[PDB]
Amino acid sequence: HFLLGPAAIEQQKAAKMQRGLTPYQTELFMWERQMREIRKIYRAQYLQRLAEVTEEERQKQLQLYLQEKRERRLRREEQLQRIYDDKKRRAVLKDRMRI
């Protein structure tokens, strides 16, 4: 509210001048210093808000990974049972024919 408020305009005028510098230079340098503070404020705010989104997305990945792991494990186990049951029958049957 200070930089974007009316106080910023009057702050530039109330500045000490220096020998060898034009009146416009005194206000220009004062405004430049103010522009440096706003950059940090936005940078801090963006990082703080980005952290919340990053954590939310991480939870979704973990939940999805666990759900997929169980589905594949159960599906693979069922297929192996059918093959194992059928393979056993052939082995015992083949020996019977040999006799």
Partner: peptide, 20 residues
Amino acid sequence: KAAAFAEQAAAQTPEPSVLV
């Protein structure tokens, strides 16, 4: 029978960002 279980978790598992 297996396909029925997949549908249940499909509507109860939000997906993450594409970039993940």
